[PDB]
Amino acid sequence: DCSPGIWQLDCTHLEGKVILVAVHVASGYIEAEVIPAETGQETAYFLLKLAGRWPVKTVHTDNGSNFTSTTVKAACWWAGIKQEFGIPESMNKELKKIIGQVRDQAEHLKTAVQMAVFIHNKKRKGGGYSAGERIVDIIATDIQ
Amino acid sequence: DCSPGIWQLDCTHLEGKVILVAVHVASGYIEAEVIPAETGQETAYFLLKLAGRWPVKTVHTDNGSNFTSTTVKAACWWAGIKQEFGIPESMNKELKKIIGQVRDQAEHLKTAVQMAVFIHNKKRKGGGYSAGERIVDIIATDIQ
Ligand SMILES: Cc1nc2ccc(Br)cc2c(-c2ccc(Cl)cc2)c1[C@H](OC(C)(C)C)C(=O)O
Numbered sequence: 001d002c003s004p005g006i007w008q009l010d011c012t013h014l015e016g017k018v019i020l021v022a023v024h025v026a027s028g029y030i031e032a033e034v035i036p037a038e039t040g041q042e043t044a045y046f047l048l049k050l051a052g053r054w055p056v057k058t059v060h061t062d063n064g065s066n067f068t069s070t071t072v073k074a075a076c077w078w079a080g081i082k083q084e085f086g087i088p089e090s091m092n093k094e095l096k097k098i099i100g101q102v103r104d105q106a107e108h109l110k111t112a113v114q115m116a117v118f119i120h121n122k123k124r125k126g127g128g129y130s131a132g133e134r135i136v137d138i139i140a141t142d143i144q
Numbered sequence: 145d146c147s148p149g150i151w152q153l154d155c156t157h158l159e160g161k162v163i164l165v166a167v168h169v170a171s172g173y174i175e176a177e178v179i180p181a182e183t184g185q186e187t188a189y190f191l192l193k194l195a196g197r198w199p200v201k202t203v204h205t206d207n208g209s210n211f212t213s214t215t216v217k218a219a220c221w222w223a224g225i226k227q228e229f230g231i232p233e234s235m236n237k238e239l240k241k242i243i244g245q246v247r248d249q250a251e252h253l254k255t256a257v258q259m260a261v262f263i264h265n266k267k268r269k270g271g272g273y274s275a276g277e278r279i280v281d282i283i284a285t286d287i288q
Pocket residue numbers: 105106107108109111112115184185186188189192214215218219222
């Protein structure tokens with residue numbers, strides 16, 4: 001399906017804390033970080049992080065105002081990301097499911113989150129690669 | 145050259161702050177994070193993060209005592225990482241070079257670091273893919 005450089009970025013709340021969640025839409029691969037609160041500075045920094053790892057062409061979000069900080073515009077600018085003016089899923093419900101199941105295993109919400117991300121990116125499809133294998137396949141295919 | 149699941153993990157110091165630096169040895173691709181101080185908890189958490197993203201088989205370090213926390217052993221255990229009992233470069237000098245050059249562009253050391261990581265992972269070889277393209281090629285090739 002989708003162009004290999006599109007990502008979706010959003011925040012959920014759990015335990016009084018904010019989770020920032022990136023989804024590479026063609027694969028389903030997520031990365032995620034617990035931040036103390038939703039600020040433009042946290043978003044910018046996460047985008048900077050994401051961009052030096054993957055080819056990030058455009059990012060979409062379900063709250064466009066997330067992206068209005070100058071901080072955030074500065075990060076998109078410097079790393080050459082364009083915003084998605086062009087899409088009018090839920091992993092957030094599912095990753096939240098996975099978090100709920102491991103929460104036991106860890107003291108800090110952040111550990112549970114990364115544990116949940118690990119499980120998600122590694123599960124093979126109901127029948128069939130894993131999100132982790134898919135993102136890498138898609139992005140390599142788009143190289144060679 | 146090297147097995148696609150080997151990583152090197154180490155810390156450098158700059159500005160009174162600790163930088164944790166992961167290097168995928170077959171590609172030269174790095175990821176990096178500024179942490180407030182070198183603790184076993186920071187290392188564990190970074191490994192958890194790294195492992196849900198890439199297939200991480202073994203990790204090496206230039207300071208084996210970094211890896212003796214139970215916290216750290218717990219993270220390697222849960223994510224199935226083995227430590228490298230089997231290697232007797234410098235990117236640290238080079239990434240530090242790249243940091244020194246961009247430091248100007250940012251207030252916080254952390255931003256400069258991610259900016260430096262971005263530049264590193266994206267530069268094409270002197271003649272020739274980039275570290276970013278290489279890691280993805282290696283890891284996809286080892287899938288199919
Ligand atoms: C604070 C902590 N203390 C521990 C003490 C003993 C053991 Br065995 C594990 C942990 C883990 C622990 C839990 C799970 C895993 Cl996979 C690895 C370590 C944590 C976790 O925090 C990090 C990862 C930041 C150190 C946690 O939140 O529980």
